[PDB]
């Protein structure tokens, strides 16, 4: 297989400012016919992929000259000379020099704004759920930027592994922030074994990590 290494994995751009995404292939994409089989696609949230640039440097019909593709052999770049706000989404490179057709891992482009620390809230499990035999504890991180955040669960100070899941909203169209929910799931029996449930949040908008916690039963 030809492996595509796409960088950077994420890019926050200021509107009006240039932006570059790079693609390295594990071998040359140059073909015998003299064309180099490198393609750039964009995919907006909820949409199908759209072709931007074909065969390294050719703009697909309808794509504006803000998009410039360059490169050769194993090294390629897509540049957005001026960035408009509508360009947010995922960008993928793809090669068709050989089968399998392979894609880069993608670059998530979001809008840059000033740092905003998350508001952090914690929710104990409901009595209704406990009755059913399971306990879910929820930690909410609300309206923050940038997207990078670390949320860890501590139960009586013991770090939790393998029993939590999180998900994050799309960047807000009005204030450019994110929100994130993390859910720790335990059996009722395990939940009743311990006292303090804590969510530890690390984000660059916070001078030090923040911990929100509660005592079970209170």
């Amino acid at each position: 297989d030809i492996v595509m290494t796409q960088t950077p994995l994420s890019l926050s751009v200021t509107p009006g400012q240039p932006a570059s995404i790079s693609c390295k292939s594990s071998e040359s994409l140059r073909q015998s016919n003299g064309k180099t089989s490198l393609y750039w696609y964009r995919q907006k949230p909820g949409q199908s992929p759209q072709l931007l640039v074909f065969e390294v440097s050719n703009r697909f019909s309808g794509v504006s000259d803000r998009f410039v593709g360059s490169g050769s052999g194993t090294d390629f770049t897509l540049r957005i000379s001026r960035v408009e706000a509508e360009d947010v989404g995922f960008y993928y490179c793809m090669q068709s020099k050989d089968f399998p057709l392979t894609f880069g891992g993608g670059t998530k482009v979001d809008l840059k704004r000033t740092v905003a620390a998350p508001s952090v809230f914690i929710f104990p499990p409901s009595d209704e759920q406990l009755k059913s035999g399971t306990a879910s504890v929820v930690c909410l991180l609300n309206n923050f930027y940038p997207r990078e955040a670390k949320v860890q669960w501590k139960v009586d100070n013991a770090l939790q592994s393998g029993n939590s899941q999180e998900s994050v909203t799309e960047q807000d169209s009005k204030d450019s922030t994110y929100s994130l929910s993390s859910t720790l799931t335990l059996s009722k029996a395990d939940y009743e074994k311990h006292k303090v449930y804590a969510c530890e949040v690390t984000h660059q908008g916070l001078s030090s990590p923040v911990t929100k916690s509660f005592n079970r039963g209170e």
Binding site: S136, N142, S167, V168, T169
Partner: protein
């Protein structure tokens, strides 16, 4: 006006089969190699299969070879993907895509530039069709309150919500107060639990002073189980 329309997706048990179709319009179908490419939930694009314009040549990804069969009908301008021996990891949105330029059978004769079928990048993609492969049975959600409290209140603003837990399959819809309240609402993407059941949360921030003067109800609809729940969320 070139368009591809996929159909045939659905919820499937592992080991079973499903057939996808892609009906096309506004181009000479048989002149174009065609592709299937899939996208797992929250993941990138993964190429699955390719078929030459004349249908004589097919190629598959390692992950689907021996399980999937690509074919086409050049009389009906339809592309197919027969998906057998389905695995959980086959769960994805499946899209039809068209090679960006025409390419026909090789000339093994009167020249020597290529003795094989030529494939290049796709231009047009269809919207896709979802195949979800799971051993789970249909199951209605439990809707639990995320109660507002001191642990969710600061500066006169409280957070509250609902946890819509243990349902299958997707989707569920959630609104607040019959859809009248959208300000300050965040409804998160569902997560698939190790149990094979989905879970999702929706939260909203409101004045803490309103908790005694205003009713907050999350409206949860899970069509596959015909479940409609209106859950009142109150301080405990």
């Amino acid at each position: 006006r070139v368009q591809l329309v996929e159909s045939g997706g659905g919820v499937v048990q592992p080991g079973k089969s499903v057939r996808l179709s892609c009906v096309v319009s506004d181009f000479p179908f048989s002149k174009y190699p065609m592709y299937w490419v899939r996208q797992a939930p929250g993941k990138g694009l993964e190429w699955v299969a390719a078929i030459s314009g004349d249908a004589w040549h097919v190629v598959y990804s390692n992950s689907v070879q021996g399980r999937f069969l690509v074919s086409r009908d050049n009389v009906k301008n339809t592309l197919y993907l027969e998906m057998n021996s389905l695995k959980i990891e086959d769960t994805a949105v499946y899209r039809c895509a068209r090679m960006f330029q025409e390419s026909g059978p090789p000339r093994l004769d009167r020249w020597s530039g290529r003795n094989y079928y030529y494939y290049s990048g796709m231009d047009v993609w269809g919207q896709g069709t979802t195949v979800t492969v799971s051993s789970a049975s249909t199951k209605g959600p439990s809707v639990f309150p995320l109660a507002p409290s001191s642990k969710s209140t600061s500066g006169g603003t409280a957070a509250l919500g609902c946890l819509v837990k243990d349902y299958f399959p997707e989707p569920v819809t959630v609104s607040w107060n019959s859809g009248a309240l959208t300000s300050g609402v965040h409804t998160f993407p569902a997560v698939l639990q190790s149990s094979g059941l989905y879970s999702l949360s929706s939260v909203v921030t409101v004045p803490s002073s309103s908790l005694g003067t205003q009713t907050y109800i999350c409206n949860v609809n899970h069509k596959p189980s015909n479940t409609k729940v209106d859950k009142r969320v109150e301080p405990k």
